[PDB]
Design a protein around this ligand. Sequence first.
Ligand SMILES: Nc1ncnc2c1ncn2[C@@H]1O[C@H](COP(=O)(O)OP(=O)(O)OP(=O)(O)O)[C@@H](O)[C@H]1O
Ligand SMILES: Nc1ncnc2c1ncn2[C@@H]1O[C@H](COP(=O)(O)OP(=O)(O)OP(=O)(O)O)[C@@H](O)[C@H]1O
Ligand SMILES: Nc1ncnc2c1ncn2[C@@H]1O[C@H](COP(=O)(O)OP(=O)(O)OP(=O)(O)O)[C@@H](O)[C@H]1O
Lengths: 326, 1121, 67
Amino acid sequence: ALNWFKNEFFVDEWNIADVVANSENNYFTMASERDVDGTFKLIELAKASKESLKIIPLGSIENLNYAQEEISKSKIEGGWILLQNIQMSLSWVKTYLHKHVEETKAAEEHEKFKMFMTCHLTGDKLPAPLLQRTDRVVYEDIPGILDTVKDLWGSQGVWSVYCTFLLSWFHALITARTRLVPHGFSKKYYFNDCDFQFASVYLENVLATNSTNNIPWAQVRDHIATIVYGGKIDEEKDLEVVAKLCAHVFCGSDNLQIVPGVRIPQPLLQQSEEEERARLTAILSNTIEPADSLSSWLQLPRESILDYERLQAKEVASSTEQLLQE
Amino acid sequence: QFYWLDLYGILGENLDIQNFLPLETSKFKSLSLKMIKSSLSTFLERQRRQFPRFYFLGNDDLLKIIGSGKHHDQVSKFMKKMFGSIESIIFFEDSITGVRSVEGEVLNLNEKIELKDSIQAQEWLNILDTEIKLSVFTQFRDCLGQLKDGTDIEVVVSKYIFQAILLSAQVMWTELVEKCLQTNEFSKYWKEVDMKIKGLLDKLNKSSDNVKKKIEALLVEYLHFNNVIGQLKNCSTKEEARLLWAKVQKFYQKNDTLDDLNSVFISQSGYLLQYKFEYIGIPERLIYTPLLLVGFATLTDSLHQKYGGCFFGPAGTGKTETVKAFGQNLGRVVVVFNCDDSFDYQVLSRLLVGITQIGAWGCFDEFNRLDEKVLSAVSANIQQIQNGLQVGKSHITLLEEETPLSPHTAVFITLNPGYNGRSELPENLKKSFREFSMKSPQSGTIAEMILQIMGFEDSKSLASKIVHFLELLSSKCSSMNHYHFGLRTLKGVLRNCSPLVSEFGEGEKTVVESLKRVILPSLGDTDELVFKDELSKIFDSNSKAIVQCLKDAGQRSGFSMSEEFLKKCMQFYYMQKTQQALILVGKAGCGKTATWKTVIDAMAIFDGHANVVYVIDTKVLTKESLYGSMLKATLEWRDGLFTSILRRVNDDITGTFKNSRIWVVFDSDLDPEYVEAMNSVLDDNKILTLPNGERLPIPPNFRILFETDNLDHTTPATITRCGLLWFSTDVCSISSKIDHLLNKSYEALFELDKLKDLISDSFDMASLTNIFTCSNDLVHILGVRTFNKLETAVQLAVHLISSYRQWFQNLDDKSLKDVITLLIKRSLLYALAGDSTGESQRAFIQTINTYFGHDSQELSDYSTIVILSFSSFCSEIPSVSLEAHEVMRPDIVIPTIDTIKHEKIFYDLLNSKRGIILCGPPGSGKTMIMNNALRNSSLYDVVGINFSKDTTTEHILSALHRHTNYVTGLTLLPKSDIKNLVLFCDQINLPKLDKYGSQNVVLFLRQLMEKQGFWKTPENKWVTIERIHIVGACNPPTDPGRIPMSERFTRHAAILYLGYPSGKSLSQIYEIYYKAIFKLVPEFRSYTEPFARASVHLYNECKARYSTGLQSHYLFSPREL
Amino acid sequence: LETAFLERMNTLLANADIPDLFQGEEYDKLLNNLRNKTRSLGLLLDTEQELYDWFVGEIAKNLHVVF
Ligand SMILES: Nc1ncnc2c1ncn2[C@@H]1O[C@H](COP(=O)(O)OP(=O)(O)OP(=O)(O)O)[C@@H](O)[C@H]1O
Ligand SMILES: Nc1ncnc2c1ncn2[C@@H]1O[C@H](COP(=O)(O)OP(=O)(O)OP(=O)(O)O)[C@@H](O)[C@H]1O
Ligand SMILES: Nc1ncnc2c1ncn2[C@@H]1O[C@H](COP(=O)(O)OP(=O)(O)OP(=O)(O)O)[C@@H](O)[C@H]1O
């Protein structure tokens, strides 16, 4: 019901790459909540742009002096410079960075310079004069399951791509499950790109030494449940939930009903890597995420997710009504 | 001649260092010596670059090691710091034949290393490092050769070092289990390993010390082998067997390559790690449990991609020892650091440089204690090290210097989330680590295996009963902070079972005695009952010498040996045998100091060893004074008090500490920002890590005591490491304490003996009991318990009675009894009801007269004794005749009866050398009364301090700068040799609480009163105070902005309450003032009375009408008048 | 600007002097100056106690503070 408005009226939506690529500015401020960080988004951006991105964390005088020197160099010669956790050194954000940005409001005379800043939305206040000059981007997770798996798949021998596809589905499903704090997992947890990357590395390492197609699916399940993702888990109930999801996904069946929608057959060893990638992409793109995916795809009670979803809708609609009255 | 000889041995007799130190060489020749010695740091850094392990030596240590290259004595002494596992170097014929480990194992080298005077330390130490690697590999090779041929395990353990035998056994076990995995035949090999376990276990009982240790560790490893082999034997399918076997560590040797030292590698979960063949000695091995194996799995997975390892969870689950055991399994020793907030970017960067160049694995414990700023800053270095290792770079740049990257390093962090004083890692730093939860260890398996190793008849039953009993205690005891029955408690119990094996016979009796000794001392009455009942329910079923030593010590010191006191002494004595860190928690005045001093004195009697005790007040000192500080401006380390003491003990220049015990008592509140710095000192690491890089070992006979009265802000990180002694109630009765105090006061003094008998008879507990009982019902402003007010009573009574000794020789018995009775009644009155109001004091006088007996000398409101006969102050008030101008003087006091009473009692208390606190509303005349009492004296000078919110110890010490001299421990004396100093503390209760609820200045004053001295921090010396007294004043702790003061301070001072004068009193005083003024205009002197009445009426009505409920500053007092 | 300023002005009105301003050689110098001034005023003050008492008395006499 909420997404109805956005889908019906609005026909476009931008990402980080869209904002950076299409902007007259060259100073960018990224913000997120605790345990969420988009530094890897910036490194992927810089690699895709063939740009040299230097990352400097702030919080000490040594790094600060080095940062001042490197800011001067990156503005005279060019290059991308990232300053992490600027809120840690507000006495310098409000004194040095404040004055310098206005100076570069003035020069606008070098094309290969871009500065990036990260901060926490739950932290201290940044000065408005600096905040209202730079571009601002909020980084957060993709809300949809199919969207998340689609993005992960788009970021990326038939067994390698097949296992990567399964891992992408697994990551999307577990990340979606983390939203239901009182119903999905007992405790709130966060999962990020590093867990996905380690799972991919382990899957590739396993595939490297099992040429017979006798894939040790039990070892894959135990490692992913226990080490890659279970390491963060400090509760037996939540680890059992993770084990259930691993058993569902990495079962090794000939045709997995990974959701009530798409069924994923196993690859044929006679096919090419490009052929299997095309087949998997077609399988992914041809389906539809249902309205009640929070229940059916996560196998949760509907009445449990009802309170969650309805209360979010309540807050959104109440705010909209209050704003519209004024 | 010291400094020249030192710098000559360092700099003088050395013509090789001049190519780097030409200026200092020439400057030394001319010779300032100290400044040249401090200028050698650049060369020391150059020498550190030539041998990375030198980063664990201080500058003085490098100076010594560089200088004495002609003797090779000093280089040996640093092995414990440089390598950790190696105690010393074994020289012979000016060559190295071996090394001696910490446990006493001797490693022989394949070839003797010939030494020359011209060869520097770094050179032949590098040679020695290569030789140790080659020798350990050689013994591994030969031992594996013999074991694979078919040699028995029991005839090889006595020939080779622990590492060789362990790794040969592991490789053979891996190979044979894999061959068994080829089929379903596991029964035969299970039986074979079981027989080997039995053989080694029986051989254990007939062994030397080193062989005993080797066999114990091998038994641990073979028990793990058998458990694994049994599990594989009991798998259902082939796939289950493969799945289980893939998860354990496998030991393979590259028998098909040429590179010898890199031939052995470790496979787990499809990932391979390289075995290092570093010498680690014979450390205690950990029982293998599923949690340990999964931890190893996660660490292996992280190391595959060169990510930092990380363990998180609650305290006491075995994180750091899991890391160390992982390193041990991989043939390397992990360097452990204790993080603190004294670390910053420079310290962590330098430590990372050291770990980088050495090629060592470093574990950072309590990583959360780093402040947020450095946690943000060091993320760049963490990322750079990870990227350098992943890419394969040869150098990395840290602190503006390019340094080589040794491709063997790893970074581990151990952090306890959600504890007081800890912080949170930022996301861009956490993403560089792989976290793993260690929430609950398998205590049952650990207990069972340890008991099986110890040789107990039935390990299974005892392990079940002990663990179940601990769970029942954790479930049934009351809700109190200091109740932790986790793994550390289990280890304490099991370790205490070890010395008691021969006492009780390898059975249940040992276990129950260990349980009692470990657990009962820390329980209350309810939990003591629960413990005893539950222990009786679950389990089925001679100290005379030390008891007599305790009796002798107590009686000689003069403390009554009550049953409770003896019980606590006995519990403390048994606890301190195996615990090097004890905490004593009890109410103020309950007798902790008596307990531990008595027990140490009894131990001194029993053993004949010396006991040196240092008492440190943690809160009064700052951390940079306690643990020392690095001056970054010069990069010069300067020791703190505790660091200085530890360094001096380790040095042991005269050997004075070889037959003695060192006691360090922390006499203040536990503070997580202070005590946690000693975490690696208190636990099994037994090492103090300093920010500069030094690593000071803790001697086995170095014990630490914490004395406090609360555990409010203390985290489990400290409570679960230290043995805890809980004092539920005072250790003695009021009668015993009065007996002690009277004996001490008398002994401090024929005539005195009969006077002692008279005084002791006068202090009849039959009436004092009731007097105390009804004293307990009064209102006490800024009050203290009756038990802690007895000291003032006894001390003042003895002083007062002894003051009249000069006139007792000519008195009859009745006169002596009357004087003693009246003096004791007055002293008791002021001791018990001194802090109450006037009406309360008079009613209490009435009760005193009632209980001492109708036929005793009566005490009245204003009774006194004059030079003997009895009189009253009310008849001894002179009039005053002031001139008009004298109303402007600040030092005029119009006499009155209540003033005279206050002045007399104050001066009497001051003469008795009891600290004084005055309390009353503003303007009541506290400072005026004090000033008037000492203005006309000839014995005391007065120094005044005004306390405030942000005053510190520095202001109080600076206040005495112009009044006192430091005269060589050190002493602090008044400049004048005729008068003492009375240091009056105005508004003592204003200084604010720190973040944990403590007043450092009030604790400093407590130290001045109680210990009669303090620590001088820059020199870390003890300063004794001779002739300085401490008095002070405050408003009651109910006015805004006043901080309640802890009982541990106020118990040391008499408290006198001073209320406002009555209306008639003010009327008379100010009528006298107006009478003085009207001399200017004598024709209006008839109006002196009504003007004073008008002024007092106006004051009263303004005070009543305009209260502070309207405005905060509406305060009215006689000052206005 | 800081609470330390209060910590000074409190002392300065609770007592005539601020001991932290005249420690060590600053004390010695102070005494020397006082001696010279004493000789210049026709007064006979021999000891550091007399000189410092005169110093604080004159301070209390001459200095007024308005907040
Ligand atoms: N597998 C094991 N076998 C035997 N004892 C073990 C084992 N694992 C841990 N222990 C015991 O656990 C304790 C080690 O805990 P450790 O010092 O690592 O705690 P920690 O988690 O670092 O503590 P903290 O959070 O207080 O710093 C020692 O008593 C050690 O004997
Ligand atoms: N057995 C005893 N017989 C007589 N008096 C005793 C006995 N035990 C203790 N006392 C007295 O009780 C008081 C005990 O105080 P102690 O010096 O031991 O410090 P404490 O109770 O640890 O207090 P704090 O922590 O404030 O220093 C002292 O007055 C001591 O004289
Ligand atoms: N004979 C007298 N008896 C009592 N008070 C008197 C007498 N003569 C004068 N006073 C007045 O009594 C007051 C004494 O209080 P004083 O100024 O000494 O307060 P204080 O005890 O230092 O208070 P605070 O705790 O607020 O610092 C002064 O106003 C003094 O003028």
